[PDB]
Amino acid sequence: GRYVPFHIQVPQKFFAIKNLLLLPGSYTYEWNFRKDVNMVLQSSLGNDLRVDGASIKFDSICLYATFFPMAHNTASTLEAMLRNDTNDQSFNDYLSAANM
Amino acid sequence: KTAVDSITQKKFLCDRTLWRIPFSSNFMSMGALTDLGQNLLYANSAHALDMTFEVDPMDEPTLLYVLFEVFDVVRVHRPHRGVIETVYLRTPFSAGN
Amino acid sequence: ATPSMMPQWSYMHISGQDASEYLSPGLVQFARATETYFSLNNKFRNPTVA
Amino acid sequence: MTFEVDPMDEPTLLYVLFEVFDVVRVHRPHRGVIETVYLRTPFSAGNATT
Amino acid sequence: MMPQWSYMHISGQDASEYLSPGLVQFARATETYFSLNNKFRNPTVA
Amino acid sequence: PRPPVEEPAVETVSPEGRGEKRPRPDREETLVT
């Protein structure tokens, strides 16, 4: 149908926080989402969906996070090992390119 | 431009499979003998079980096929010629006297 | 039924040793030599323990 | 670099990947502290001007 | 250059080598259910 | 993600997980990589 109430789960793609294992703490986690129907949507003809009446409206966004139920002495040892300056989690962008 | 006031229906079909619920403390497969089957609660004492299924209604007599996953194991002993001896033990739901 | 289920989990190989460990050392040496033409691998129960 | 392309009757772009090492190293020394050092080479995004 | 490539692990030691030996032994034991493998950068050098 | 490796350091490719002719299906015996 034309009128679609959606329910979507959008992954995280930024490579520094895509596979990051967060240690304990209180972190703010803020993000900007697009409402542009020429960007958030894809038509099979490439027509201008702003002229063509397409519109998106965001009701609510919830952040979900599945924790591994690790034992509190194992997850205290893993926390203490990963806070050393030699155990720093280092990542790499897969493209690894400058874009011009 | 004359689209009707529509309402959305969502469902899933998942054929050929059994709904696996593992008896593990984190729902994972860390081994065939799970950590709750080796637990001091569930091995050193006896427990009842009361499972309760809410299903969709059907206009037909249907069945419920629950697999209580056990260790259905044979050990085959052949000590002499023409002699074959098998010892069966499944745990928990043993069927021997 | 038994308070310690280990003597019959180890007997039926529910929790115990691999077939490299509970079999006789000549049979393990035999099954490695004949492995490409006469497989004795699936004849013995190997336990995995969480 | 001097590219030579087929002509097209439409304004086109040219998307060159200058392949670098876009690497992040993440340090979390205390509770609630999230320190990251980003570095890519050759096409670094930070020099002495910034 | 070379002191910061070894810091950012562009050229240097693999994660079996620069990580503390307690963390490598943890990552091998919990490998089947809690993988720490894609969290650390392994340099390959021509 | 990475082929199997022995460590004699030098870093030596291990021959485990390779395909063979077997009289019995190889998935029920080993992991084939």
Binding site: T74, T77, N92, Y94, L95, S96, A97 | M30, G31 | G16, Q17, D18, S20, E21, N46, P47, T48, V49, A50 | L17, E19 | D14, A15, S16, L19, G22, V24, Q25, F26, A27, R28, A29, T30, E31, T32, S35, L36, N37, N38, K39, F40, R41, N42, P43, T44 | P1, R2, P4, V5, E7
Partner: peptide, 29 residues
């Protein structure tokens, strides 16, 4: 030790490989 966190295939803890600790993949590198 951290070897009691691994599933025991037999009487031995099934330890993962040392080569699976880091990632190395890039865009053709």
């Amino acid at each position: 030790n951290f070897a009691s966190l691994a599933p025991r295939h037999g009487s031995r803890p099934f330890m993962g490989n040392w080569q699976d600790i880091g990632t190395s993949n890039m865009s053709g590198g």
